[PDB]
């Protein structure tokens, strides 16, 4: 082998192989010929110096120009490319698979990396597959996530983690399930709130709620459809509220695999819940299965008061209306029940800040 403009005998690996014309050129003549064309000729003069051989050429030539030229010479190449050819900055793409950067000025939505020779969508940067043809990137991204075996193996744990906990004070989002503990502590803002209804957990004598009888205790106030109360329901009764409104729920899966955060010396460690997964609980523990049912209940704005008996309606009346109810003359228990239910649903809405 030898350089095609000066004849210098040199091995193939020690010269620059022009990807277009395949002329072998020494580093010195390559570097000298292309910098003089930038500083004294025009952009069209940057053909090979040996053979005299538009946008794909510059896209490939930019690679070899970057390694051989000087920084100020490489900048003049982008300047003349912008001011003489493109009227704008060149579209520079970064390969997500091999971290190589390259100019891509073609019409196709699939770019082939000049380094790792792998093809990717120029807008979502994921590796190109035939399923992406004629499909939005979100449809394609959803197709891969819903065909990833290890994502499906997680089961409903992903649904509980996707529905995250947003701090009502500092809006910091946590991609965590609630579990059985409702008293949440935000590390960023120190605000204490209920993860089910986002109401404040008040310190001693901080609660402003009227007729509160636990003012001197750490506590919060919850709407009747908050997980704080609905966690005490049986899974059967929670499913009954769902069935009465034609809301489907899983009982079979599609140690509990729900990810929790254990505080360790090195910060926070992702630990699995690992509690018992009873039959009919979709592979989750008891607390996370009830959390899954209550999330479906909350998402559809189902009212648990529709299943209240008389004693439950009296408790709700004293709790949310601050009045001990009294049966009226001529009322039977059904009429007493309907009156209490009507007044409760009219005056006391469901959780106004519950994530639905």
């Amino acid at each position: 082998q030898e350089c095609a403009v000066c004849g210098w005998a040199l091995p193939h690996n020690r010269m620059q192989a022009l990807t277009s014309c395949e002329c072998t050129i020494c580093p010195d003549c390559f570097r000298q010929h292309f910098t003089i064309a930038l500083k004294e000729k025009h952009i069209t003069d940057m053909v090979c110096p040996a053979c005299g051989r538009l946008l794909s050429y510059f896209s490939t030539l930019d690679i070899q120009l970057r390694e051989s030229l000087e920084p100020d010479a490489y900048a003049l190449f982008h300047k003349k490319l912008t001011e003489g050819v493109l009227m704008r900055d060149p579209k520079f793409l970064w390969c997500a698979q091999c971290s190589f950067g390259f100019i891509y000025e073609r019409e196709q939505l699939e770019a082939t990396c000049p380094q790792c020779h792998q093809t990717f969508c120029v807008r979502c940067k994921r590796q190109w597959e035939e399923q992406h043809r004629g499909r939005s990137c979100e449809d394609f991204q959803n197709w891969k996530r819903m065909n990833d075996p290890e994502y499906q193996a997680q089961g409903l744990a992903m649904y509980l983690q996707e529905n995250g906990i947003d701090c009502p004070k500092c809006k910091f989002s946590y991609a965590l399930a609630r579990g059985g503990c409702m008293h949440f502590h935000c590390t960023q803002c120190r605000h204490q709130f209920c993860s089910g209804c986002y109401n404040a957990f008040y310190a001693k004598n901080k609660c402003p709620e009227p007729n509160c009888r636990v003012k001197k205790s750490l506590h919060g106030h919850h709407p009747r459809d908050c997980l704080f109360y609905l966690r005490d329901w049986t899974a059967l009764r929670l499913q009954k509220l769902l069935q009465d409104n034609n809301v489907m729920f899983n009982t079979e899966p599609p140690g509990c695999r729900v990810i929790e955060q254990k505080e360790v010396p090195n910060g926070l460690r992702d630990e699995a819940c690992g509690k018992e997964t009873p039959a009919g609980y979709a592979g989750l523990c008891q607390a996370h299965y009830k959390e899954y049912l209550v999330s479906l209940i909350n998402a559809h704005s189902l009212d648990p008061a529709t299943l209240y008996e008389v004693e439950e309606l009296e408790t709700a009346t004293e709790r949310y209306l601050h009045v001990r109810p009294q049966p009226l003359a001529g009322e039977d228990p059904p009429a007493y029940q309907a009156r209490l239910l009507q007044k409760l649903t009219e005056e006391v809405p469901l959780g106004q800040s519950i994530p639905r």
Partner: nanobody, 119 residues
Framework: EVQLLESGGGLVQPGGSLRLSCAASGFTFRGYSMAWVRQAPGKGLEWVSTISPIGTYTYYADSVKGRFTISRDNSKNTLYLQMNSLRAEDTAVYYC?????????????WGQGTLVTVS
């Protein structure tokens, strides 16, 4: 949130060995390529190596290829860089980097860095 913690940097003699680790959390580790970069004193950031999501492919800078070996354990969400026959030029702060599918950058997260000094 995303977290990349490097460990394993220290003082080593020329010709010695050193194994760096990168503990990752806050993202599906197996779904992204991972990389190592470094910054020598007074110099610019230099790419070292990149490994594909499940480790099928590995890429190396010419100055480190063969001496360095990148690997990953997706079951533990950890990225490794085995550095063998360390030279004085390898003295740098070594950063763990997460591959990005966002337009405009090959990586969207870097770790805090670990300092390696070769006599």
């Amino acid at each position: 949130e995303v977290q990349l913690l490097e460990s394993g940097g220290g003082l080593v003699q020329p010709g010695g060995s050193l194994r760096l680790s990168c503990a990752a959390s806050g993202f599906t580790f197996r779904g992204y390529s991972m990389a190592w970069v470094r910054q020598a004193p007074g110099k610019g950031l230099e790419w070292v190596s990149t490994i594909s999501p499940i480790g099928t492919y590995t890429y190396y800078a010419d100055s480190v290829k063969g001496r360095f070996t990148i690997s990953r354990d997706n079951s533990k969400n950890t990225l490794y860089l085995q550095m063998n026959s360390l030279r004085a030029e390898d003295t740098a702060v070594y950063y763990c980097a997460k591959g990005s599918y966002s337009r405009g950058t090959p990586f969207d997260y870097w770790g805090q860095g670990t300092l390696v000094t070769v006599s």
